[PDB]
Amino acid sequence: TSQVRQNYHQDSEAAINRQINLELYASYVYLSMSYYFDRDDVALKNFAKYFLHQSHEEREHAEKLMKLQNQRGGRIFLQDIKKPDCDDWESGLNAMECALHLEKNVNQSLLELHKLATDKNDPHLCDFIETHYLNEQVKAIKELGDHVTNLRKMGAPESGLAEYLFDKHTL
Amino acid sequence: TSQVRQNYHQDSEAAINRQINLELYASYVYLSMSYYFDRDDVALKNFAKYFLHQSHEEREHAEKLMKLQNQRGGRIFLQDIKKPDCDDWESGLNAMECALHLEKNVNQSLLELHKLATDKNDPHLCDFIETHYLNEQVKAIKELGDHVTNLRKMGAPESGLAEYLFDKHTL
Amino acid sequence: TSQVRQNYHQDSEAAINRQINLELYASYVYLSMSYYFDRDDVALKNFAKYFLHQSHEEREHAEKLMKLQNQRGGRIFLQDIKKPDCDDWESGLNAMECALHLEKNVNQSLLELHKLATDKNDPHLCDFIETHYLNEQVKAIKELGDHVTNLRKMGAPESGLAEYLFDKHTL
Amino acid sequence: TSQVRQNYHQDSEAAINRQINLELYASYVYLSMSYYFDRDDVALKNFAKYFLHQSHEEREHAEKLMKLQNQRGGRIFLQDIKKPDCDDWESGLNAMECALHLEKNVNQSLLELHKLATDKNDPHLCDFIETHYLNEQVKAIKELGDHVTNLRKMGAPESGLAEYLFDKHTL
Amino acid sequence: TSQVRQNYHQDSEAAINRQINLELYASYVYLSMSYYFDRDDVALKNFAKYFLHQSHEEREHAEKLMKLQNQRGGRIFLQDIKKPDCDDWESGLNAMECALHLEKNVNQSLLELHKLATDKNDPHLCDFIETHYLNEQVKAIKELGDHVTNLRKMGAPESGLAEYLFDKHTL
Amino acid sequence: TSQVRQNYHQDSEAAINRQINLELYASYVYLSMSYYFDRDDVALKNFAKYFLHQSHEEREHAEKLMKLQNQRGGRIFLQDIKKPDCDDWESGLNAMECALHLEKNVNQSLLELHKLATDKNDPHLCDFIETHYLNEQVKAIKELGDHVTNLRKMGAPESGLAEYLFDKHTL
Ligand SMILES: [Fe+2]
Ligand SMILES: [Fe+2]
Ligand SMILES: [Fe+2]
After folding, report:
1. Measured between alpha carbons, how far is B38 from E150 in angstroms, rounded to an integer?
2. Is C58 annotated as a binding residue?
C-alpha cells in the first residue's frame, strides 16, 4: 504494498482482525439478552432497555477498529459470527453475572494486543488502544460489580419484589 | 402453553425464525461493502455512506420481527451468521448489481411466508407482512434498477471519470 | 505586642488554637466515611454524597476560626492531624451512630470555650460563639437523631432492602 | 479477592497509598502560608488569595487518587498528616521559593510511581499518571520560576515598594 | 543550570532543536507550491488556497515545539532555512505526489525522536509527541493518498478537463 | 514571453526578487526576539506578544510582493533565508534599538527600488510602492523612537523596576 503503509507489522494486522470479530460477538450476546426480558412471563422493561443500549455500543467499537485498519493500510477479513451459549438466562442477577464475566474476557484480550504492539515498537497503535478502549472497560466492570452487589443484598433471586423494585428505582 | 397464544401455528413460528436470520445476514453484507469503498486505492466516499445507511436499516427490520414473535407468544431461536461471499467487490457498478440480486431473494422469501400464512387462515400475520415489508421491497428494487441503468449509460466500468461524477451528482 | 490587641487574654488565645485542630480532625473523619460507601462491595451512592458534603463544611468552620484569631491580634499555631479510629465502618446505621457521637463531643468543647470567655469578661468572643457555632450544632444533632430512629424502625442492620430504600427515598 | 480486580499488583497498591498522604500534606502547607499573609503586620491580600487557591487544588488531586484506588479494587489506608516546618514564612519571596522547592519533590515522586508501573506491565495506570498529573506539574514549576525571577529583579526583599507593586499588578 | 530543569537530557535538547528546523523547511516548500498555481498560464485557484493553508499549519507546529523547549528549561538555537528543490512543479498530480513524499519523511523523523525519548526514561516527552504529533501525521498521509488515487483514475496528467473538474468538485 | 506582460523591465523583475527575500529575513529576526522574552530567567510577557505580532506582519508584506510579481507577468525565484546575528538579546532596551536599526535598512532599500522604477518610466510600480509600503515604514520608525526615549528616561537598563513597569503600562 500500500502507498500509505509505514511501520505496520503483519502480526499486528492479524490481531486487529481477531479483535473485530470479538466485538461483533459481544453485540450479538447483548441482543439476545435484551429480547429475553421482553417475554410475557418475565416482563421487566428497564432490564430490556439497558441491554439493548449495550448492544448498540459494541457495534460502534467494532466499526471504529475497521476505520483504523483502513487508515494504516492493512486489509480487513471477516469470519462467521457464532451464536451465544444460552437461549434462556433465568433471572436478572444471572444475566448481570454473565455480562460481568464477558467484559473481563474482552479486557484480557485488549491487554495482550497492547503487549504485542509494545514488542514491535509501534507507538501510534499503543496510544490508540489507551485513548479509546482501555478506560472504558474498567468503568464498565466497576458498574456491573455495583449492580451485582446491590441485587444480592436486596434478596434476589428468591424474591420477585426485589427485582421489581431494582427495575423501578435504579434502571 | 403461553397464556397469550391464540391461533398461531407451529409452522409459522418456525418460518419467522428463518426470516430473522436472513435479515441479519443482509445487514452484514452491506457492512462489508461499505468499508471496501473507504480503502485508499478506491476512495469513493458517498458510495461508502450509502452502503452504511442500508446496513443500519436491515438491523431494524430484524428487530421488528423479534418484537412480533414475542407479541404472539412464540419463542426466538438464533443461529450462526455466515460471512459474505466476496472480500473485494471490484468496482462501483458490480456492487450495485450484487445489491439488486440480493434484494430480489429477500422479496422471494417474503412471498412464500405470505402464502403459508394464507393457508393456515391467519389474518393478523398476513396484514403485518403487507403493512411493513412488502411495499418497501418494491421501492428498493426500483431504485437499484435506476442506478444500474444510469451507470451503464455513462460509460462505466472502463471509465473512472464516470464513477467520480456519479458519486458527486447523484449520491 | 500587636498594635490592634485590646482586651484579649492569653488563655482564650490558647483555647482557640485547640478548637481549630478539633474541627480539622472532624473533616478528616467524614472524608474517610465518604470513601467507604463508594467501594464495590458496599455501593451506596447517596450515603457517600452526604458524608462528602459534611466534610466540606467542617473545613469552612476551621477557616473561619483562623480569620477570627487574626482579627483580634493573636498568633496561629498548628499541630499534627491524627488519623481516624476505624478503617472499615461496617454498615449504614453504625456510621450514623458514630457521627452522632462525634457531634456531641464537639458541642461539649464549644460549651467550655463559652464558659471561659465569660469568666474573663470578653463579650465580643461570647457573641461570636453564639452567632456562628451554637445553633448549628443543635440542628445537626437533631437531624442525626431522626436518621438513626428511622433506620432502626425499618429493620436495619439485618435487612439489605431497608438500607437500599432509605438511600433512595430520604437521602 | 475483589470481584473487579484484574492485573493490579500489591506494590502498586502500596505506592498509591503513599501518594495520597503526600498530596494532603501539600494542601496543609499552602493553608499555613495563606493565613500568614493575612496578619495585620504583613497585610498582603493577593498573596493570601493565591495561596488559598493552591490549597483548594491539592485536595482535589488527593480525592481523585482515592477514586482510582476504589475503581481498580484496592483498599485505602490513611496515616497521620504531619504539620509544616515553618510557622512564620518571613517575606513574599521566601514563600515563593519554598513553594517551588516543594513542587519539585512532588514531581520526583510521581516519576518513580510511573517507573514502577512500567516494570509490572500495567498500561492503564501509566496512562492515568500521564493524562492527569504529569503536565500539570511542569506548568506549575514554570509559573513559579517566572514569579521568583521578577521579584528578584524588582529589588526584593530589601524593598517594601517592590512587593506592594507586584501584589497589585501581577497577582 | 536552569532553575526549572529536572530529568531533561542533553541529547533530547539537541534533537528538539533539529525538529524545529525541519518544520520551518516544510512551511517554506508549501509556500512555493501555493504561488506556482497562481500563475496566469496555470491558473488553478483552489489548489493555491489548499497549499496556503498547509503552509500556515506547519508554522504553528514549529512555534509549539519552541514553547516546549522553553517550558522544560533548554535553550533554542536556530540555523539557516534552505530553499526548496524545484522552482516549477509541473502539474497538479506531481505536486500532490511530492507532498506525500515529504510528509512520510517528517513522520520518520518523529518516530526516531520517540525512540530516543524512550531510551532515556522521559515520560512527559513521550506523551507530548503522542498527544500532538503522531495522529495528525497519519491523517495527513491518508488524505493525500486519496487525492492521488482519484486524480490518476480521472485521467490526469494528459487531460486538462480532469484537473479542472477535480479543482471544482473536491477542493 | 508571458501573454500579460506590458512595459515591465528585466531589472525591475530582479529587484522585486531581492525585496521578497529581505522581508522574509525580517520576519525570522522578530520570531527569534519573541521567544527570548519567554525564557524563565527573563520572563517579560508583553514584550513577547509585541514581537510575535511584528513577525506575523512581515510575512504578509512578503506575500503581497509575490502576488504583484505574478500580476505583472514575471517569475518568482527564492533563495536561502539566513539565520539572525544574535542568539541572546540581553535586555529590553537593546532589543528595541536593534529593531529600530533594522527598520531603517528596510526603508533605505525601498527608496532605491522607487528610484529605479522612476528611471525606466514605470508609473504603476511607483504608485504601488507609495500606496502600500512607504508610509507604513515612517510610522513604524516613529513608534520605535518613542519607545527608546521613554525607556532611557525611566532609568533602564540598570534598573529592573523600570522594565517591569514599562511592560505593564505601555505594552
Ligand atoms: Fe460537472
Ligand atoms: Fe418504594
Ligand atoms: Fe504603578
Report:
1. 12
2. yes
Residue B81 DSSP SS3: strand
Name the grid cell of C139: 440542628
Q: How far apart are CA E133 and CA E131, in angstroms?
A: 6
Beta pairing partners, D81: C81
**Is the CB of residue C158 less than 8 Å away from at least one CB of chain A?**
no
D162 near F CB under 8 A: yes
* Interatomic CA distance for residues F20 and B40, integer angstroms: 39
Say if the Cβ atoms of A41 and B2 lie within 8 Å: yes
Q: Looking at beta carbons, which residues of chain C come within 8 Å of D41?
A: 2-3
**E2 Cα to chain A: minimum distance (Å):** 31
Question: How many Cα atoms occupy the beta-carbon half-sphere of F138 within 13 Å?
Answer: 6
Q: Which domains, from first to last, does chain B contain?
A: 1-171 (1.20.1260.10)
Length of chain A counted residue by residue = 171
Nearest to A145 among C40, C160, C161 (CB): C40
Segment (H or E) for B54 = helix B45-72
CB-based burial label for A69 (10 Å; 0-12, 13-18, 19+): buried
- Measure the CA–CA gap between A28 and A104, rounded to whole angstroms: 17
- Rounded to the nearest 10°, the torsion over CA B132, B137, B138, B141 is 160
Q: Which of C23, C47, C35 is nearest to D77 (CA)?
A: C35
Q: Are F153 and F79 in contact (CB under 8 A)?
A: no
* Amino acid at position D158, single letter: E
Report the length, in residues, of chain E.
171
- Cell numbers given for E116: 530516543
What is d(CA F6, CA F2) in angstroms, rounded to the nearest whole number? 9
Task: Compute the distance between CA of residue C7 and CA of residue E99 in angstroms, rounded to an integer.
Answer: 82
Q: Do chains C and A touch (3 or more CB pairs under 8 A)?
A: yes
Residues 6+ apart with CB under 8 A from D52: D30, D31, D34
> C73 φ, ψ to 5°?
100, 15
- The answer to the question of whether B13 is labelled as a binding residue is no
The half-sphere exposure of B103 on its side-chain side, counting CA atoms within 13 A, is 23
Helices and strands, number each (H, E), in chain E: 6, 0
CA-based nearest residue in chain D for residue A131: D127
Q: Give the span between the Cα atoms of D99 and D29, in whole angstroms.
A: 9
Pull the grid cell for residue B137.
421491497
Q: Name the neighbours of E, counting chains with at least 3 Cβ pairs within 8 A.
A: A, B, D, F
E135: contact with D, CB 8 A cutoff: no
- Determine the distance in angstroms separating the CA of E74 from the nearest CA of chain A, rounded to an integer: 25
Experimental technique of record: cryo-EM
Copy the grid coordinates of residue F98.
536593534
Minimum Cα–Cα distance from B41: chain E residue: E149
Number of CB atoms found within 10 A of residue F75's CB: 12
Q: What share of chain B is helix, strand, coil (3-state, %, to 5)?
A: 75, 0, 25
Residue from E120, E16, E24, E116 nearest E74 by CA: E16
